[PDB]
């Protein structure tokens, strides 16, 4: 009876579609995300900070700390098993 007009009705149509739900999701997931590894806090300073940078960081993550623990028992020979039970 006349010229129908569904070419321009997306101003209220862009709310119910599924991609819009993902659209409003990931845009919030993007703006505050740190750009290039910023704010990594690589300078750890808490009590034994030196340990935090050699083995406690996790780059090595090997049996050295338990080796250090074992050597501590060895150095305590005349303190726990000798001169005492």
């Amino acid at each position: 009876v006349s010229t129908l007009i569904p070419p321009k009705v997306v101003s209220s149509k862009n709310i119910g579609s599924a991609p819009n739900a993902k659209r409003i999701a990931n845009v919030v997931h993007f703006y505050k995300s740190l750009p290039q590894g910023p704010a990594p806090a690589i300078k750890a300073n808490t009590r034994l900070a030196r340990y935090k940078a050699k083995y406690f960081d996790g780059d090595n993550a090997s049996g050295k700390p338990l080796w250090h623990f074992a050597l501590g028992i060895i150095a305590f020979g005349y303190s726990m098993e000798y001169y005492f039970h």
Partner: protein
Amino acid sequence: NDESILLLTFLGFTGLVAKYLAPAYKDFADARMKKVSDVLNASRNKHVEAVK
């Protein structure tokens, strides 16, 4: 004495504990962070083309 020899022997054993002849858990871990890192490349990009 005898006690000192035993500690030296286990240090050699601990030295052998160091090798494990290219330990599997080293490579078992090596397979992990690459697997962990790679999926984050795919997963984050998966929604990157969602807006694209």
